[PDB]
Design a protein around this ligand. Structure first.
Ligand SMILES: [Zn+2]
Lengths: 134, 171, 74, 126, 454, 102, 121
RNA sequence: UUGCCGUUGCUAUGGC
């Protein structure tokens, strides 16, 4: 028929398939270092919270970058904080043990269904798989 | 956390007696919390064993699980197999907390001296003073547990009892 | 002229039994019922205390030539 | 390591539980199941009605001990070799053997209950 | 094949993450950040400076004027130098003395100017770790560091102090203790063209200071053994190496984050690599560093390795296994105590207990193409790094320095195409931390200066 | 002794201004001491003490560091023009109260 | 067979020297030959490290007979200088001993090194 | 050219 401008198909998603087991294997076989903190600087409330998870320190780094980048403190916006801070810290003390989150091992989500087993390079021909190898 | 199945059998009572006495715990909730999340950990590793070799779930979640267990420190570097996650147990998890570790490193004379040092803030891993006893130190924070520099057992100015006794003996 | 209230009307701990200083702390109670337990364990088993301390003085408590405390099979 | 007896095997097959997989998801640990020669003698003496149970006890994953006594009384053999050593879980469903085992101290007891195995005197199951 | 399936599934994973060169290739956020980059100030300190002094094969090597000025101080320990943009040098010893030199008289040996000797008089009257504010050293000064501007020298050692002396008079202007019991300092480095000092203290700690404000900036934690060496350039990065944890870390000090680099050479795979057709083995302790530029550095190990590391690879880029030789085996008249040479030879086990020299000094000239290694093989070695920055290679040797080389650094002279340098190297007969060193083979406690040309 | 570190210094000619982030370092002190910090900032940069300003102070846990947002003006008059009135009430000279009714 | 027979290769030597350094920090190491034989006849020792290149060799070969008597693992590191440097003292040591402790934070590492040198021995 | 001490050079070395 006709085209219709779809930001949901030229928007960077990159999160439906971001699995922590694959990302951990990539960090293992990365062959370039990882920017870890000086060891005491990443625990949070004198140990009343966790250490902090890798996603939490990534998000903290993003927030401080945006913070310094346009000179604005973030706030105590009530609905978003009563959702995200309390639910986040309660699943943090549920699943984050010693700076490592073990929540994923208790979660049904198929690895190979979404994040592996390529869909575009599906190679549904003997000739296409032969040319993809050679 | 969650309570066990038969919470009052005599083996469980002598178990909790030995655990709380050997690790200086305050009540049953420490054992029950760390055993609940250990139950989740090795209930997951059981399923990772019940699936087969060269399964994607088994390969990636297995080496992920044993590497973050090694980095928590309950599993040593050489046993990189997934049946040691099943051999893991509860005192392997609560030997990693900061009270146990302060006593084992010898900054305290017992686990109770370690608990009161931690709650009186004389102990800092790395940069920050940790002040709760159940902290689960990691394999990289294992060697920077030392006395806080803000504390008289470090090198700081002595506390109120020492300075008041010094002042009254100067009077 | 201010007739202040006192502790028994304030805290209202009416007619309690005498209770325990060790019960006033949940940690010290398990410290002192584990010390009791591992003093009772020396009675039932024989506990490895750590080996020979100094010169071997002797058995210090007696040797029974009639008792055999060993588990026979079937 | 878990000592099996004959009614535990019969109740396992009647409830459709695998032996080593039922043990593994009961204890959340790696199990070694042991058939003593007297338990095996009892399963063989049960006749040709119990052929399914006998050739499920014949399993390379189920290791097997060598009892050295006369007669095939598995309850006596299990009780003796567990109160000698205290390194054994006893998987059983006999009421009398369950009472013997839970009267001798330090011995965990496993039993088919419902549609999976249960364990009682093992104080670290979760 | 499970690792093949891991690599394959990781490749498919990265392809799928890409899923979720044309004539127009411009990205709005990148060009907006580049507009902010055009707007900002301070393109001064944060040069990611690459190797811009390519002169390794250029200058002469074999005919240096080598003067080994022996001094009467037991076990010299460090060397600090200075150039403005007359040149002074500094030495310090285990005899608790700092000594100022003039070095600018380039064609001859250096000139002594001023002593500053601590001793038993400076032991504090408290034995209490925060009133350590005396004015001299009472134990084992391990490191000196001259300011890049030259107002001060700052020194410290096993008395857990930092004493900052003025240059013109060698007087203690300020004392800063490290406030704890094990706080012995082991290495000091100013960041270049600055007033900021990076000290590496044996508490697995790295302290930072501003010297002209007499203030401490930041304490940063994270090694696992004692931080045996430190190195810095004009950037606010730093590179430290702890001894036995066999890792070298580099620190973004404002961010207080780090990049770790472990070693990882194994004689099993290495002897198999030779077995495809040999006395080389695993690693003891990474000991010394020098940051060559803002993307690479080089580490000196305990088994004689010199390794070259990038900022973008965990495992090292290049190794050099034996860099100063293997030690002379203990004699048959000093191993066994039998009578016959056959049994005293059987007590050597062949080659099993030959231990290599360990590189105890390493100095990369900043942003240059050439670094200098030193141990008690008697001969300093000079190596140049290849222009593709993936290897180095031995140019020549400087064989006039009998003893342990506790410090190497160079002093520049000459213009952009014609240059001459004097390599200072502190020479002792004893390692700069403990004794441990037998077979003192003609060593002397001196300053080995060499004048290299062209 | 407090210690000062400026980072990411950009220039805003539209607002006649130079702005940056301020890592303030006070080992064994309480906190930033903002007027003394404006003094130290006005002497590390040029004079303009009623034209230097800081607003966004966050001290990290355990003390020592605090990140603030520093903006320094030339021309104190145009600093008074461009700064907001609450910060002028906080630091400088302006004081206009709101009419208290209803 | 030499006199200093059960020598370790380079990987085992560095494992041994790392746990020696950690025990020396944790006050679980008794260093020197006669302190080692003192703690050996007292029975508080988990394994003894002798260095196979000191200037006599029988000077520490007296210790394998004691270890054999009391069933304690003993292992030969090929550098007295590296052994002293791992021990953390400013001199070479020729023998050291890991004392037994159960309030010890490196018990798993000590047990792993004990198993390695006992399968060697 | 130094803590002593030796060869010293009319400057280099080597024993503690
Ligand atoms: Zn039997």
């Amino acid at each position: 028929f006709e085209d219709r401008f779809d930001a949901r198909e030229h928007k960077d998603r990159s999160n439906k398939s971001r699995m922590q087991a694959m990302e951990e294997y990539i960090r293992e076989s990365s062959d370039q270092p990882d920017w870890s903190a000086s060891i005491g600087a990443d625990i949070v409330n004198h140990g009343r919270g966790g250490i902090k998870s890798l996603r939490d320190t990534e998000k903290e780094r993003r927030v401080t970058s945006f913070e310094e980048d346009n000179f604005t403190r973030l706030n105590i916006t009530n609905k978003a904080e009563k959702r995200k801070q309390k639910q986040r810290e309660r699943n943090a003390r549920m699943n984050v043990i010693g700076g490592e989150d073990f929540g994923i091992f208790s979660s049904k989500r198929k690895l190979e269904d979404s994040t592996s087993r390529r869909g575009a390079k599906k190679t549904r021909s003997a000739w296409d798989r032969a040319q993809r190898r050679l | 956390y969650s309570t066990p199945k038969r919470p009052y059998e005599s083996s469980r009572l002598d178990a909790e007696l030995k655990l709380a006495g050997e690790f200086g715990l305050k009540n049953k909730k420490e054992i029950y919390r760390i055993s609940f999340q250990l139950s989740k950990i090795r209930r997951a590793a059981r399923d990772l064993l019940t699936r087969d070799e060269k399964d994607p779930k088994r390969l990636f979640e297995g080496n992920a699980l044993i590497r973050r267990l090694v980095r928590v420190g309950v599993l040593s570097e050489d046993k990189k197999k997934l049946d040691y996650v099943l051999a893991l147990k509860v005192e392997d998890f609560l030997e990693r907390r900061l009270q146990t570790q302060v006593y084992k490193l010898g900054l305290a004379k017992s686990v109770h001296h370690a608990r009161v040092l931690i709650t009186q803030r004389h102990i800092a891993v790395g940069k920050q003073i940790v002040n709760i006893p159940s902290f689960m130190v990691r394999l990289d924070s294992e060697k920077h547990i030392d006395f806080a520099p803000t504390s008289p057992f470090g090198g700081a100015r002595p506390g109120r009892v020492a300075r008041r006794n010094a002042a009254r003996k100067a009077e | 002229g201010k007739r202040a209230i006192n502790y028994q009307i304030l805290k209202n701990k009416g007619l309690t039994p005498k209770r325990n200083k060790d019960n006033r702390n949940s940690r010290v109670k398990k410290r002192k019922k584990y010390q009791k337990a591992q003093k009772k364990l020396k009675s039932v088993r024989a506990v490895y205390s750590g080996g020979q301390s100094g010169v071997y003085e002797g058995e210090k408590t007696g040797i029974k030539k009639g008792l055999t405390r060993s588990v026979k099979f079937k | 390591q878990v000592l099996i007896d004959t009614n535990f095997i019969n109740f396992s097959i009647q409830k459709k539980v695998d032996i080593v997989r039922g043990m593994m998801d009961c204890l959340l640990a790696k199990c070694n199941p042991l058939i003593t020669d007297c338990v095996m003698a009892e399963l063989e003496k049960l006749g040709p009605k119990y052929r399914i149970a006998l050739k499920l006890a014949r399993d390379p994953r189920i290791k097997r001990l060598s009892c050295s006594h006369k007669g095939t009384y598995a309850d006596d053999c299990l009780v003796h070799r567990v109160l000698q050593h205290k390194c054994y879980i006893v998987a059983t469903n006999d009421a009398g053997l369950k009472q013997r085992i839970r009267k001798i101290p330090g011995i965990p007891l496993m039993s088919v209950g419902g549609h999976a195995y249960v364990i009682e005197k093992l104080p670290d199951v979760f | 094949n499970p690792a093949d399936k891991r690599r394959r599934l990781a490749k498919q994973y990265l392809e799928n993450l890409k899923s979720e060169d044309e004539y127009n290739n411009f990205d709005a956020g990148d060009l907006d950040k580049d507009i902010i980059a055009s707007r900002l100030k301070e393109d001064v300190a944060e040069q990611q400076g690459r190797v811009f002094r390519y002169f390794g094969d250029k200058l002469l090597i074999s005919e240096a004027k080598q003067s080994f000025t022996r001094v009467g101080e037991n076990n010299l320990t460090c060397i600090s130098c200075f150039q403005p943009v007359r040149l002074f040098a500094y030495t310090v010893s285990k005899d608790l003395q700092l000594t100022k030199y003039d070095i600018t008289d380039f064609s001859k040996r250096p000139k002594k100017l001023k002593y500053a000797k601590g001793g038993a008089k400076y032991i504090p009257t408290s034995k209490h770790e925060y009133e350590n504010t005396t004015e001299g050293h009472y134990d084992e000064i391990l490191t000196v560091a001259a300011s890049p501007d030259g107002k001060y020298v700052v020194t410290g050692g096993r008395d857990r102090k930092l004493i900052v002396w003025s240059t013109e008079s060698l007087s203690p202007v300020k004392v800063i203790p490290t406030k704890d019991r094990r706080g012995e300092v082991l290495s000091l480095a100013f960041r270049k063209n600055s007033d900021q000092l990076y000290a590496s203290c044996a508490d697995f700690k790295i302290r930072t200071y501003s010297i002209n404000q007499f203030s401490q900036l930041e304490i940063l934690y994270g090694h696992h053994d004692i931080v045996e060496d430190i190195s810095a350039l004009a950037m606010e990065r730093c590179v430290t190496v702890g001894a036995r944890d066999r890792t070298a870390m580099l620190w973004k000090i404002p961010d207080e984050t780090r990049l770790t680099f472990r070693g990882g050479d194994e004689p099993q795979k290495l002897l198999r690599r030779w077995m495809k057709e040999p006395l080389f083995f695993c690693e003891g302790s990474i000991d010394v560093v020098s940051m060559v530029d803002d993307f690479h550095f080089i580490t000196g190990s305990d088994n004689g390795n010199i390794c070259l590391w990038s900022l973008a690879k965990k495992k090292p880029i290049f190794t050099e296994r034996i860099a100063h030789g293997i030690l002379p085996e203990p004699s048959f008249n000093d191993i066994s105590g039998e009578t016959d040479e056959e049994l005293r030879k059987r007590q050597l086990q062949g080659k099993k207990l030959l231990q290599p020299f360990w590189i105890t000094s390493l100095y990369a000239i900043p942003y240059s193409n050439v670094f200098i290694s030193g141990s008690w093989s008697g001969s300093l070695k000079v190596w140049k790094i290849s222009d593709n920055l993936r290897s180095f290679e031995l140019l020549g040797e400087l064989s006039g320095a009998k003893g342990v080389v506790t410090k190497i650094q160079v002093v520049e002279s000459g213009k952009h195409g014609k240059e001459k340098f004097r390599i200072l190297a502190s020479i002792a007969k004893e390692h700069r931390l403990g004794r441990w060193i037998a077979n003192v083979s003609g060593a002397r406690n001196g300053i080995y200066s060499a004048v290299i040309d062209q | 002794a407090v210690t000062i570190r400026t980072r990411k210094v950009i220039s805003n000619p539209l607002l006649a201004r130079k702005q940056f982030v301020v890592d303030v370092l006070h080992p064994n002190r309480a906190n930033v001491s903002k007027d003394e910090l404006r003094e130290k900032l006005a002497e590390v940069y040029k004079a303009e003490k009623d034209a230097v300003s800081v607003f966004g102070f966050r001290t990290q846990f355990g003390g020592g560091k605090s990140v603030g947002f520093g903006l320094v003006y030339n021309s104190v008059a145009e600093a008074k023009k461009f700064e907001p009135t609450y910060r002028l009430v906080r630091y400088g000279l302006a004081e206009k109260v709101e009419k208290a009714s209803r | 067979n030499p006199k200093a027979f059960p020598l370790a290769d380079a990987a085992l030597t560095q494992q041994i020297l790392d746990v020696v350094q950690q025990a020396a920090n944790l006050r679980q190491l008794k260093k020197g030959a006669n302190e080692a034989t003192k703690t050996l006849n007292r029975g508080i020792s988990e394994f003894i490290i002798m260095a196979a290149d000191c200037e006599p060799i029988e000077i520490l070969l007296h210790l394998p007979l004691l270890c054999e008597d009391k069933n304690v693992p003993y292992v030969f590191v090929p550098s007295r200088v590296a052994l002293g440097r791992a021990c953390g003292v400013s001199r070479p040591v020729i023998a050291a001993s890991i004392t037994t402790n159960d309030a010890s934070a490196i018990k798993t590492q000590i047990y792993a090194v004990k198993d390695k040198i006992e399968t060697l021995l």
